[PDB]
Every structure is written in structure tokens, then in C-alpha cells.
């Protein structure tokens, strides 16, 4: 009864003298009301049917930003750290390599987080599916007085499969950078997500590869360098891991 | 003004985004552009609108014929080999040569070869004996893009004849694509032989 208290009070105010009521009463719903709480975070619901009141410290400040900037980087660092410029591969280019020799080959999704040293390795273990756009910088440095060029081609997954049946002369139908080493020492090449499915598996080469072929052999003079390194740096323009999985599990997200 | 780059002095590394080219000028000539037909024959819709022979098959019994369709490497169809992906409707042209019977054509992109057991639910077109029929197949594939190089790029074709006796009947298939969406150019394939 919610009127139970207010009948005792009325009775006591009808019996009151000059010293006021001798009794008082109030009825109300308990301070341990029957309610259900539900909390959700990312991929997580927590249905509690007997919650307690949640507590917080004395006058708390839940802004987590440091006002003195003891780590003076943007707070977005650590969420944008799995997409920084990393060294994907490195090879050597002998002066005896012919005119269609394949120098490097970088398995595109998996080579961004294939090893612990790559800072996107940690995030890549918890997701099975990815969709991402790359930025490559292939760097080849030679001294002045050495000729030869290279072809930096982005071959997508269908081209990897059928590469043996293709003409090398029309290999520049793909997003390429034909780089004369006497001039440039770096070929930039932005590649978007190119696949036949919306997402690829993380641990796969299913966004093709980024090969580096010899366009014309090194024409070195006597008493000059013979080997020339070819480094491939990559950076993800956008990264979008999606399917949660057990740590480093091989989860197939394709239909056979 | 005309710069020396438009007289043909360039660097191949200074080619920016792919497929960006400019014409050069000489004193006495420049690009002409003469149309000698009212429509282009290199427009993508137009060129693949014409059909091309795929396969022929002799039906010596009533059994379903599963034939995986794919882009050809001969004919005029092979210009699709310059692309990696494809999305679109495909027309299938079936010439049923029989004395009696009907041929039940159906198309699926489903790789499971056990969904043709009850063929009716894949959408059957019955072709009378000695007739031919063009059916337009919609893009009912799980993948949003078909890989051109795959052996079952254009899905599978199921033909089950309503045989009269065991008298064989033949069927020639020709494919063509109505409004194809081709993406991402890839290298030209090398002619047969070579190596």
C-alpha cells in the first residue's frame, strides 16, 4: 500500500495538539527495486537481472586525456599505428639478371602483418577478414653512371594465377610505375581494394602481389656497384578488419 | 600553348594515373577522328552483344549435362581477357537439334552439382525439338564479381532433354553478354604456342 503511510499520518494529525503529531509514516517502493540492467560493448552483451547501483570515485574525471601531454603524440596514435609505413621486403638485383627476371614479390594482405616487427600484426590476429587500400613506395638507388630500369607492377589475384600465360610487353596494363633508375629512386603507387569478393582472408595473398621485374638490365661500368637493393615500403591507406576470430585461427570466409 | 611534352618528349616514369595519355602534334598532322559508321564497334556493350560458339554436346540419354561456361580465348569474345572481373547478365543461345523431344535449359552459378537433381527450380526453359532459343541469365552469383580467368566464370549450364527413345540429339551453345560491367584491365594473354 502506497496510501498506508498516509493514513497513519492523517490520523496522527487529527490527534495532534500544540506539540504536533506523535507519529509519522511513509510508504514507498523499496531501494532495491526489481529491475534488469543490460550493458553492451563491442561484440558483447551483458544481461544482469539483479544489478546493484554502479559506483564511481569521489568527484571523478573520466576524460582520459592527459592535460600535460606526457606522450605528446595524437591520441589517435595506436589506432592508426597498424597502418604506418613498414618495410615489406628487400632484395638484391645482380647485374646479371636478364630482362624479365622477377626481383621481388610481396604477397599483399599478409605481408603487412606477417611478422611481429610489423605493427599491424597484433590487430590482424583477432580478425579473419580484411578490406584495405595500399600505398607502396618501391625504392631503388643506383649511383650516377649506371643505367637500367625496373617495372613495379601491382598484379591482383587473377593475374598471379594466370601469370605464365601473359605477355610481359603488356604488363603495363596493370597499375605500374616504369622507373628509370638514372632519374628516380622511388616509385609511389596507390592501389585500392581490388578483389572478386568484398573481403579477403587476412592470412592470404588474395589481393595479389606487388612484383618488381627487371625492365632493362643494369648497365654498370667497371669499378661500380653490381648489386643494387630494391626495398618495398608499404602503408595502408585504409584498414578495415571485420570478422572476430580466435587468436591467429585460420577461419575460412569463402565458399568453395 | 604547345609544350615539348606535346611534341613527344616525355619520361615513362612521369606517367601519372593509369590510362592518361595525350596526343602529340607535328607541324602538318594531328589526330583526325573520322567516323565511318553511325555506332562504335569498340563500345563494350556492343562488342560482346554478338555471340560466340562455346560447345556442342550429343545427348545419347536423358541425363543432365553440366557445362561450365567461361570467357573464350578465341573469337571476338576474347577481348574480355583484358579484364580481371565481370558483373552482368549473359545471354545463352541454345540450338537444340532433335527429331522429337524438348530440352530443359537452366543456368545456375551455384557450384554444387547436386542442385541440378531437381532441375525445375533453377528456372527451366523448354526448347521444342529443332528450335533454338536465347535466354538472358541474371547475375545470381554469390561473388559480386566473377573472375574472367576462372573455368566457371560464367556459371554452369544444365540441359536435360526429354528424350524420345535413345535417339541422340545435339545442342550447340553460344554465349554473349548484355550490358557487361568489366573492371580492372590486366595484361594481354600470349598466343597459343609461344613457349
Amino acid at each position, epitope marked *: 500500500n502506497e496510501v498506508g503511510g498516509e493514513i497513519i499520518t492523517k490520523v496522527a494529525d487529527d490527534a495532534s495538539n500544540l506539540l504536533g503529531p506523535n507519529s509519522f509514516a511513509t510508504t514507498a517502493q523499496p531501494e532495491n527495486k526489481d529491475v534488469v540492467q543490460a550493458t553492451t560493448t563491442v561484440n558483447t552483451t551483458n544481461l544482469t537481472q539483479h544489478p546493484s547501483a554502479p559506483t564511481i570515485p569521489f568527484t571523478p574525471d573520466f576524460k582520459n586525456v592527459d592535460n600535460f601531454h606526457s606522450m605528446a603524440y595524437d591520441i589517435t596514435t595506436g589506432d592508426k599505428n597498424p597502418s604506418k609505413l613498414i618495410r615489406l621486403d628487400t632484395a638484391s638485383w645482380q647485374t646479371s639478371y636478364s630482362r624479365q627476371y622477377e626481383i621481388t614479390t610481396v604477397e599483399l594482405p599478409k605481408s603487412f602483418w606477417d611478422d611481429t616487427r610489423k605493427p599491424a600484426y597484433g590487430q590482424a590476429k583477432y580478425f579473419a577478414a580484411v578490406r584495405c587500400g595500399f600505398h607502396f613506395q618501391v625504392q631503388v638507388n643506383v649511383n650516377q653512371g649506371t643505367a637500367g630500369s625496373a617495372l613495379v607492377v601491382y598484379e591482383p589475384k587473377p593475374v598471379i594465377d594466370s601469370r605464365q600465360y601473359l605477355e610481359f610487353g603488356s604488363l603495363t596494363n596493370l597499375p605500374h610505375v616504369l622507373m628509370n633508375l638514372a632519374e628516380t629512386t622511388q616509385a609511389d603507387l596507390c592501389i585500392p581494394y581490388v578483389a572478386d569478393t568484398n573481403y579477403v582472408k587476412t592470412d592470404s595473398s588474395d589481393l595479389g602481389q606487388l612484383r618488381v621485374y627487371v625492365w632493362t638490365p643494369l648497365s654498370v661500368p667497371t669499378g661500380a656497384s653490381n648489386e643494387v637493393d630494391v626495398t618495398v615500403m608499404g602503408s595502408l591507406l585504409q584498414l578495415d578488419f571485420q570478422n572476430p576470430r580466435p587468436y591467429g585461427e585460420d577461419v*575460412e570466409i569463402y565458399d*568453395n | 600553348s604547345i609544350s615539348p611534352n606535346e611534341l613527344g618528349l616525355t619520361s615513362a616514369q612521369d606517367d601519372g594515373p593509369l590510362g592518361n595519355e595525350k596526343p602529340n602534334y607535328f607541324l602538318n598532322f594531328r589526330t583526325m577522328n573520322v567516323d565511318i559508321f553511325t555506332v562504335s564497334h569498340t563500345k563494350v556493350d556492343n562488342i560482346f552483344g554478338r555471340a560466340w560458339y562455346v560447345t556442342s554436346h550429343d545427348f545419347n540419354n536423358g541425363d*543432365t549435362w553440366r557445362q561450365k561456361l567461361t570467357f573464350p580465348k578465341e573469337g571476338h569474345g576474347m577481348l574480355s581477357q583484358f579484364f580481371a572481373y565481370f558483373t552482368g547478365e549473359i545471354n545463352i543461345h541454345i540450338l537444340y537439334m532433335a527429331k522429337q523431344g524438348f530440352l530443359r535449359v537452366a543456368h545456375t552459378y551455384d*557450384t*554444387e*552439382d*547436386n542442385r*541440378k537433381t531437381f532441375l525445375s527450380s533453377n528456372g527451366v526453359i523448354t526448347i521444342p525439338a529443332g528450335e533454338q532459343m536465347t535466354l538472358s541469365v541474371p547475375f545470381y552469383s554469390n561473388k559480386p564479381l566473377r573472375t574472367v580467368r576462372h573455368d566457371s566464370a560464367l556459371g554452369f549450364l544444365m540441359c536435360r532433354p526429354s528424350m524420345h527413345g535413345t535417339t541422340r540429339t545435339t545442342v550447340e551453345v553460344y554465349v554473349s553478354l548484355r550490358c557487361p560491367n568489366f573492371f580492372f584491365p590486366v595484361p594481354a594473354p600470349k598466343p597459343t604456342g609461344s613457349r
Partner: antibody
Amino acid sequence: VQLLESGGGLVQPGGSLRLSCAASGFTFSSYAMSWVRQAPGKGLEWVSAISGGGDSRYYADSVKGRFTISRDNSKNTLYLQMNSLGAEDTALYYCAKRLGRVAEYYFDYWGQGTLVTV
Amino acid sequence: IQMTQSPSTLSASVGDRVTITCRTSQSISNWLAWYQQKPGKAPKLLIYQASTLENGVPSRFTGSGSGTEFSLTISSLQPDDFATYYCQQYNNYMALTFGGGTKVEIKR
């Protein structure tokens, strides 16, 4: 449920016998049947399967274009017209029945087999 | 395609946990099945759909795995679990195949 094959024997190379498999104890026409063979002391190669209506026949590559699995739902008998036999067709031929509620082929009940010697 | 089993002969005592593995070339999505075949008898279905148990099959048998790595496990051998075990598969192509067999025999 009991399958009983019959028709095994001895034939000369390039022969042509046809195994039968009278079946009882179940509604025959609502299940696919197969003929899986077992060459002496080894494996279990699957020769061919026929769907419940008989409107779909599958053959293994090894015996394809030679054997012809048929069935005659009326008298509950599954056939295996084998033509142009080799010495690789010397096996015990079991007549398996397809499993119940599943969308895949798994062999439920099996016969006792009939030897074929070539 | 062809799937190869891992042991071709296992020898173990009555009460041991034996594991026969079957490994396919390409993924089949739980579409495996295990057979027991006593010598001179026709095969018996044990485990269909990679882990389901056929009726009247002991609970010793327990299949697991999916994709390309299936395994039948007998928790404790009994004297009637000495037989040959084949793994038949189902795939899209309807190219049903069986394993090589794995003879499980007495360890004397």
C-alpha cells in the same frame, strides 16, 4: 532394410555383366543408391550413384563412360550395367543406400557384395 | 581431389585412445563420414557429417574437425573396435571418394 546384390561372376576382359540389387525394407524410390566396390584387400572406391527418381546419375572418373547405373523403382531393383571390363574391375561390388535427413551422400545400409572377377 | 589418411596401421591395447586423421586437399564443410569395416563384412556407418553419430553406434566414437582436417577418436578401445576405418567424403562435384583405410589391430 536389407539390400541383396546378385549378378556377380567371372567374365573375360572386355566383358559385360550387369549386377542387380533387389532392395526391401524401405521405400526404395525415396533414396539414392550407389555402387561402391572394394578391390581385393584394399580401399573402397565409389563407382556410381543414382538419385531417388533416377533423374541424375553420377560416375567416378575411373568407370565413367563404361558403367551405367539404372534403377527400376517399380520392382525395387538397382542395376549396374558394366561394359568393357578391365582387370581393375575385379572387386566385390556392394550396393549402398543413401542416408536419411542430410543434404550430402553418406552410405547408410550396405549389401553383402557380389564378387566380379575379370 | 584425393584425401589421405594419416596412420595406415594403428596398433593399440584395449582401453587406449586412438586417433585416425583424414586430410582432404580442399575444404569440404563438415561433409565427411567414417566407416568401420570388420574383415569379411560390409562397412557400417559410424559418424556422418564429421561428428554426428549414427544410431546404435557407441559413444566411444567421436568425430571432429571441419575443412581439411577431420579425425575419428575412439576414447577407449573394446574388442570389436579392431577393424579398418575409411573416411568417405562428399563434395560439390559429387566425386565421392574414400580414404585408404586405417587398420586398427591388437598390440600384443
